Amino acid sequence: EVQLQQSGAELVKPGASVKLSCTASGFNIKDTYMHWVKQKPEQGLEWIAQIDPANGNTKYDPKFQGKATITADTSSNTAYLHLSSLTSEDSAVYYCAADPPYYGHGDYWGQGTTLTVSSAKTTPPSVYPLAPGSAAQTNSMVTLGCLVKGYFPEPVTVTWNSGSLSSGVHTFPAVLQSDLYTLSSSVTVPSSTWPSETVTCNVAHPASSTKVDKKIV
Amino acid sequence: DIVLTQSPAIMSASLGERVTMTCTASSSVSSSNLHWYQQKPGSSPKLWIYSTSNLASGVPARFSGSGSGTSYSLTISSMEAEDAATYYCHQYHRSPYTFGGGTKLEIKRADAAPTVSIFPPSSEQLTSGGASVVCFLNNFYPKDINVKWKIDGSERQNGVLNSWTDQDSKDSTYSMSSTLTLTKDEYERHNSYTCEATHKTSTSPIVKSFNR
Numbered sequence: 488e489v490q491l492q493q494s495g496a497e498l499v500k501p502g503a504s505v506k507l508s509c510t511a512s513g514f515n516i517k518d519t520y521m522h523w524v525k526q527k528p529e530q531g532l533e534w535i536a537q538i539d540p541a542n543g544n545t546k547y548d549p550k551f552q553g554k555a556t557i558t559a560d561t562s563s564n565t566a567y568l569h570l571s572s573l574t575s576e577d578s579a580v581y582y583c584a585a586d587p588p589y590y591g592h593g594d595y596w597g598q599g600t601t602l603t604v605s606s607a608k609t610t611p612p613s614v615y616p617l618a619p620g621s622a623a624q625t626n627s628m629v630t631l632g633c634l635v636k637g638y639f640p641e642p643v644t645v646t647w648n649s650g651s652l653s654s655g656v657h658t659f660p661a662v663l664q665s666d667l668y669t670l671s672s673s674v675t676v677p678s679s680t681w682p683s684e685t686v687t688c689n690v691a692h693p694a695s696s697t698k699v700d701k702k703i704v
Numbered sequence: 705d706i707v708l709t710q711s712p713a714i715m716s717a718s719l720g721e722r723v724t725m726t727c728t729a730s731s732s733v734s735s736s737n738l739h740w741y742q743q744k745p746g747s748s749p750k751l752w753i754y755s756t757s758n759l760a761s762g763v764p765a766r767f768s769g770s771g772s773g774t775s776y777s778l779t780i781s782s783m784e785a786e787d788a789a790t791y792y793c794h795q796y797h798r799s800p801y802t803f804g805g806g807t808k809l810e811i812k813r814a815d816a817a818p819t820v821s822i823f824p825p826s827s828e829q830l831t832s833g834g835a836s837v838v839c840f841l842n843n844f845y846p847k848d849i850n851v852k853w854k855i856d857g858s859e860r861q862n863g864v865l866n867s868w869t870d871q872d873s874k875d876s877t878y879s880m881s882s883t884l885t886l887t888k889d890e891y892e893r894h895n896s897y898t899c900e901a902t903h904k905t906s907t908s909p910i911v912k913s914f915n916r
């Protein structure tokens with residue numbers, strides 16, 4: 488399988504720098520052109536730099552004026568992207584891409600490397616249960632939720648009863664409110680499975696290593 | 705910097721319908737150096753059409769491409785559910801190489817009103833020293849909707865944060881969540897909390913609230 492393998496997710500503080508790597512297998516990078524493309528959260532695509540591994544020649548979009556440095560090592564079949572003076576506008580997914588290495592096929596893109604630049608510290612999410620107030624009126628069906636607030640960094644893992652409920656579930660995209668993320672989830676079940684059968688909310692934070700379960704009552 | 709402009713920005717096509725989107729460049733580029741990419745949330749952009757009119761490996765024959773100079777387009781003879789995505793045109797003609805702003809293709813379905821549900825701050829949360837009021841508006845169509853928070857007859861604008869989900873894979877509907885976050889006191893210091901959702905499915909708004 489011809490493929491481009493990129494280094495892992497990056498979490499850096501502003502002012503710092505970070506070097507991303509991309510290793511090709513299936514072809515020699517010296518026989519094509521290697522690039523790095525950037526995609527900001529829920530945004531578009533931007534080409535950053537290009538390099539010819541055969542002679543080390545590079546091309547840069549003037550906007551990444553000497554903040555981005557592209558290099559390549561034919562011996563390890565690897566291309567790199569160095570980014571200095573990291574700011575939040577630098578947070579994004581970075582893809583390395585190869586021009587078609589062989590006649591008969593298209594280009595090659597890596598899995599992407601997510602870079603997050605924040606000053607925030609690791610903070611566990613606080614999970615709160617969302618259940619109907621005193622009275623209730625819907626018949627046949629009911630909706631319950633969960634509030635995951637003030638956590639960093641992404642992501643959090645929410646499931647209802649360990650994957651038991653995989654229908655009628657709505658876990659919304661987190662939101663950044665002053666360096667911290669907050670998200671909420673809802674699920675709907677027939678009023679015949681609740682409140683008799685327990686419905687649980689399981690939110691886990693990979694970073695702070697927190698695992699909390701919120702029972703909807 | 706050859707700028708590429710894609711029209712339309714967003715669009716919906718009922719199943720089986722014919723679709724067409726355009727890409728226009730600030731200056732002319734070779735038709736051989738103009739390509740289109742398809743991207744779905746969470747994965748890398750994938751080559752869809754290369755050199756203006758050629759289909760990439762595995763791309764369905766219902767797709768086509770055409771153009772030269774500064775005007776190009778992508779077409780789907782018949783809309784199918786898996787066509788739903790964001791398509792970007794790209795010029796690899798002169799550097800800096802650029803991409804268009806993209807065209808998001810969504811699925812058109814029969815309108816459906818929003819199922820609203822509001823919730824008050826948990827004591828767990830209240831004792832922590834804060835108060836968040838949440839309101840879900842689930843499974844509706846189209847995506848167009850407005851949400852208002854009326855804290856004691858005096859709409860609260862600031863402190864509200866929303867989040868929308870992508871078009872649902874099963875029913876092709878949308879959903880939204882609004883969260884009003886006040887402080888400890890601010891919340892109990894009032895007692896009328898309302899979530900008002902106005903959706904094109906009905907003139908009469910949908911309201912939900914609670915007291916204390």
Ligand SMILES: C[N+]1(CCc2ccc(NC(=O)CCCC(=O)O)cc2)CCCCC1
Binds near residue numbers: 524584587739
């Ligand atoms: C890496 N790339 C590749 C541009 C490009 C794409 C495709 C082709 N050529 C083909 O795809 C031919 C495919 C042949 C086939 O599928 O039969 C040439 C350049 C240029 C820099 C920015 C990111 C995209």
